[PDB]
Design a protein around this ligand. Structure first.
Ligand SMILES: NC(=O)c1ccc[n+]([C@@H]2O[C@H](COP(=O)([O-])OP(=O)(O)OC[C@H]3O[C@@H](n4cnc5c(N)ncnc54)[C@H](O)[C@@H]3O)[C@@H](O)[C@H]2O)c1
Ligand SMILES: NC(=O)c1ccc[n+]([C@@H]2O[C@H](COP(=O)([O-])OP(=O)(O)OC[C@H]3O[C@@H](n4cnc5c(N)ncnc54)[C@H](O)[C@@H]3O)[C@@H](O)[C@H]2O)c1
Ligand code: NA
Ligand code: NA
Ligand code: NA
Ligand code: NA
Ligand code: NA
Lengths: 513, 51, 515, 515
């Protein structure tokens, strides 16, 4: 994430705006864009003004059925296509995403409310997801040999697991959808994507791009719609054995329960209440920058947000105070403005839920230091009452509080004190979640020690969340299961096969002799 | 041959026969949790917010 | 002098028994399943470094004994490399079991022969047993590798196979531990062996052969030839039936061996010299750092390849820290190997003492400041006269990294302390030698630690601790310290050969020629 | 003779142009980022294997040129090994891209210089581009290894670092493909390079240097020194600043190089000679087998290291099968490298043709039965006079595995057919060679195929097919065919150094010494 990002021309922005309201965002099924059979659609708001940006086809079980059949029918040929050819398609898709980057940026900025200074990197990462997994396509069947002396040869290989139903969140539509779509396609599987209803546009755009890449029909399908309708239908469909989910923990339970009906394989990346542990001996200037960014970037709407700030008592007053002042100075404004740091939340219904947590925090004794209410003015004087803007918020509280135990998914931070390493660790792990954790300290042994004991899928020492694609990404506890990233994704998208064969006449027990 | 097993190999089924694998290192993917630990070797670039 | 009824858990009676058998029984070669002398009948003596008296004699092997040993290993390779891994595993476990049963004898024998304190040698016997117990578990995985399927058209898979007989040439400081370090993997991976141990401490090897025979290894699988490096050693390196060679010794010996090995393009796995540095920063736990650097250079009588012979200390604490190193070295108890109070014993041979003292003199003449030691130990901690043994006082110099005592391996209890003003300079000086075996870094700063770990040219880096090994990790050095690696699966790359097997799943296109 | 308007998709005009450029421009060295001649001004010529006339000349490099190249590689190593992997990947992809851009010129140049059929050289250029595009994807994984945590007390982890400047010494048969096979991985993994190409076909190498300069590699990262093996070659092997060495050539050269490399304990990755056998069983798809064995020995003018120079055929089908091989060989079209209908071109140099004829003669006096060929090809399939070129007729002998023609590498279109009574014998004869590069088995029986694949002493075994490669697999030989492996992650073991880093998670126990 660069310190400065270029703006998109006024004309391009205006062109994207009219194209969104000019034509409904349709499903992509069996190689073509189509509306729901009912003809029904649903609207998607522009979080900066709460005005309708456009509408998308309202898919149900009928559209999902057609999509699942299409994916199933195309699985035979796609899984048998040469890896080198699948690689070519993915690299092409990566190329085209870069070519349409400005469009995608505007689209997600207006639809999801993320700032351009974040969205540009997201679009770049979306293309990268394809370029990255394109190099794994040719290694997708590889595993091991287990020879036994000169008597037997056992060898293992991997084969595409089958159609994948990808259910994605609304915070980073393109980024988190391509993150699952790329490996799925690379590994020989077909796909049915069901985008979050609160930000469906970039998905239809992605479909246009995959069509421009001339991906075979049925290989990639898209079905816009509500989770309770198109979503639930996808989870229940007999022809889609694999499901990836990125959302709330409770949604994971619902999806898993319904998935049992067909013993489906699930790869869920759920919520989190990732802690940031700041020790007195750390580089406090870097720690301040990291913590402020890790909770307020993405408008605080990201699973790896450091929503709990554990600070060593001896520096609690000074450090937390510096965090408050920084949050106070955060530039709140329109997403398209390249200067904006924090934009509006996704939907008024989400802003309501977040305000609900703020209020609950007050009622339970948490000490509100800054924010905690709707933003009225931007950093440029603009009136922001029409959008879903929340001021960056900082509370001082106790780890057992509701606002410290439940995911808020908003720019709300809770600062909690700890007397020593043992207590910092205890409090850090005392959560139902376990996605990420951040530790700021200069002591070598303390750092690695905490990294080993912190119950999280990812631990970042002395920095914010900086990712390296080949590493296993995922959570423990209530944050999900399974891992994405390089070869680790292989374990979910493919099946292992052990093939055995004797090198000479083996001993075969005699029965009925 | 008939079913002759070598314990280190991944054992399990596909479709209606189950999921996951048992056997040597493959058992590890089920009984254990992976963890990725990151750390910079020199002052990294951290985006500035509220400066 | 009977210092106690038991030392390192060994009865004094056992100690005297072992000493007596060494003088009574010549150490013979073990060839084609039998103990035999050299055809010439010649033998060579081995001294007791504590008194320089003859402990006993060992057969002086030459080209003829080596030829017979190589033929035996070669002839037996055919059957041994095809034995079931489970069966080889059984043998290694039996060997480990028998080493443990003869532990007291082995400890005393090597102690008397090589001069290390008995308790340390006893712990080394345990490590030797562990070497076999460890690799016993890799035997059944020795053929394993990967599959590289190509869509539905081809299947490529790889396997590993025993590479061939291994000539194992070892040093005089730790006979049992260093020889079993190579023998165990060689055998586990299906190869036969011909061991040629250092001539200054031959006894333990003949004893080891006795044990392998007690384990009932097939004839020819393990062979032993005692003798001088230029005789038995060079003959083994030159023999056409021993394709693999492991060498643990001096860097210069590595050059001579490689040159000789070229005639048959032999595969070599050398673990050579070292001049490993210890870098102590002002922000580290100085109490632990002090314990570590003192131990890392003076333990094992300074005759340890991974010894931190160069101590780099940040300037702002140089005077105080180095001063503390000096007082600790001054307090080190020097005495007989069989005395439980001894911390530093005698060097291996008078010739080695003359060489080490030669370096001490080189240091004095080049401007190095001698702070302690620098000459023979006259009296033991108990007031005994030590003039008959090869005892050297723990020695500490303050010098510069360009000095000869800083650049060349002394292989004795001699340390050279060198200052550095900052991280950049600490790293530059650390890497400025022709060696690259180990390195030790003492600092509490997370980023500086990993940064230096990545930049230090060494096969092994230890952060905030002395040398503590974990067998599965790759062990070896860079630069003049050798090449290749030992340890778990890493050893496989040397002892086995990779093979890529390909087969089409359907009729492939064969270019048409002459059709 | 203008054979056509276009050959291998290349216009005759382009062919003529490349040909005259060679006569006008001497092939210079590329040192420290600039093309330079030898300080002495000396040069040596390269012949056109089709007419034995001088195509052009190349600078005759010696010790002074190698010294300058080694220093440049050394000096550049510091920064190059520290460049970001993503940036090195960009460079390799740029090189790959530029190789394709200059593909026609490279194809013609090497065709003219080394004598292979133009379309085959053109295909080889595509493989050279692929070498860079392939390793480009490994650059970012070059430091990766493992973690070996020990409970909650220790963390041991391993990484890999660039090993150092690499001296690449290559053969004359396939200049571009074989040099890039080593250059690509060397650069991808952070090492600098000094290339010393075979003197019989130097042009392509200088062209490759022009291309790398076009890709704008930093000065000193890639250096080239033209010259003879005993001059520039030996100088490179002996230079102290080039720690790693790749050699692709004859086994005898490997011995000489290893001996010379001993002086600085250099790491060698040799791919040497071979006498790869093809085993044909009565139950195999004999039509595919026939196409496969004919191609595997006669393609590439028989100058391919993996050529199946020995044909082992089961007795009951020996007469029929070998008879068919003979007729196919008789039908092979011998002609000029630029003639689209040519199947077999001229050998590299008159000295080589004579060397091959020497073996043909030796085989006859030896008792081998010549079935076809066995002498110079004086007339092409079009009736042209080929007497001024180095053309050999595809040759087929029936002999015994112990014969010199069966034991020694001829490196030409010469085949030796040998019979076998059964699997046991086929395996015995197949392995009874001082070589062990490749092996080909033709049989439909599952268990026999895998059984033979496991027992055949070769680095690569192909079942029911000719030589079809998959880059990620380990490529190399055993016995006299070399050591080490190239290909994907296997090349890492040679181009990088492993490092084990250890750190305690809590205060460890350091043995108390001197207190
Ligand atoms: N890297 C390691 O792991 C490691 C471990 C232990 C000891 N060492 C090193 O070993 C050295 C101690 O060596 P040493 O005194 O035994 O030296 P050394 O090299 O002379 O002895 C090693 C072996 O080499 C044999 N040898 C000597 N000349 C030979 C020749 N021309 N041909 C064939 N064999 C020959 C000897 O007989 C002996 O068995 C030190 O430099 C120490 O650092 C290294
Ligand atoms: N294993 C493989 O992958 C592979 C691939 C291609 C060719 N080959 C083998 O290479 C051979 C063809 O070899 P060639 O005719 O180029 O032979 P060669 O060994 O004489 O030439 C190889 C390189 O060695 C250099 N050289 C020669 N003498 C030298 C010395 N004293 N010091 C340093 N360098 C020296 C030469 O200048 C040349 O660049 C065949 O035996 C073939 O089997 C093997
Ligand atoms: Na929206
Ligand atoms: Na001795
Ligand atoms: Na020595
Ligand atoms: Na030529
Ligand atoms: Na040659």
């Amino acid at each position: 994430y660069a310190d400065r990002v270029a703006g998109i021309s006024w004309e391009t922005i205006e062109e994207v705006r009219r194209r969104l309201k000019e034509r409904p965002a349709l499903h992509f099924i069996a190689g073509e864009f189509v509306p729901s059979e009912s003809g029904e659609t649903f609207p998607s708001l522009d979080p900066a003004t709460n005005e309708v940006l456009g509408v998308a086809a309202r898919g149900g079980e009928r559209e999902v059925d057609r999509a699942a059949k299409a994916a199933h029918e195309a699985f035979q040929r796609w899984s048998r296509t040469k890896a080198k050819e699948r690689k070519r398609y993915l690299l092409r898709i990566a190329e085209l995403i870069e070519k349409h980057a400005d469009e995608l940026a505007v689209m997600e900025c207006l639809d999801a409310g993320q700032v351009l200074r974040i969205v540009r990197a997201q679009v770049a990462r979306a293309a990268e997801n394809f370029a990255f997994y394109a190099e794994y396509a040719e290694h997708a069947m590889e595993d091991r040999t287990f020879p036994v002396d000169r008597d037997w040869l056992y060898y293992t290989v991997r084969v595409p697991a089958g159609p994948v139903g990808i259910i994605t969140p609304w915070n980073a539509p393109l980024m988190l959808s391509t993150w699952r779509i790329a490996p799925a396609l690379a590994f020989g599987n077909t796909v049915v994507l069901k985008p979050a209803e609160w930000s469906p546009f970039t998905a239809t755009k992605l479909a246009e791009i995959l069509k421009e890449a001339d991906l075979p029909p049925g290989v990639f399908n898209l079905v816009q719609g509500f989770g309770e309708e198109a979503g639930a239908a996808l989870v229940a469909h007999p022809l889609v054995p694999l499901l990836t989910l990125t959302g709330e923990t409770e949604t994971g339970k619902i999806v898993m329960r319904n998935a049992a009906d067909h013993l489906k394989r699930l790869s869920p990346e759920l919520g989190g209440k990732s802690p940031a542990l700041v020790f007195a001996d750390a580089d406090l200037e870097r720690a301040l920058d990291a913590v402020v960014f890790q909770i307020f970037s993405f408008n605080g709407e990201r699973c790896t947000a450091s929503s709990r700030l554990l600070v060593e008592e001896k520096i609690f007053e000074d450090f937390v105070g510096k965090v408050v002042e920084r949050a106070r100075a955060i530039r709140v404004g329109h997403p398209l403005d390249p200067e904006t740091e924090v934009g509006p939340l996704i939907h008024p219904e989400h802003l309501q839920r977040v305000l609900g947590y703020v209020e609950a925090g007050k009622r339970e004794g948490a000490r509100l230091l800054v924010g905690g209410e709707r933003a009225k003015t931007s950093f440029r004087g603009e009136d922001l009452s029409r959008g879903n803007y929340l001021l960056p918020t900082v509370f001082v509280g106790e780890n057992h509080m509701k606002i410290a135990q439940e995911e808020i998914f908003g720019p709300v931070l809770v600062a909690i004190p700890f007397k020593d390493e043992e207590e910092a660790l205890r409090k850090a792990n005392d959560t139902k979640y376990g996605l990420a954790a951040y530790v700021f300290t200069r002591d070598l042994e303390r750092a690695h020690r905490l990294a080993l004991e912190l119950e999280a899928g990812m631990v970042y020492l002395n920095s914010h969340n900086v990712r390296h694609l080949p590493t296993p990404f995922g959570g423990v506890k209530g944050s999900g299961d399974r891992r994405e990233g390089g070869t680790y994704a292989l374990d979910f998208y493919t099946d292992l096969k052990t093939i055995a064969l004797p090198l000479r006449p083996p001993h075969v027990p005699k029965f009925g002799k």
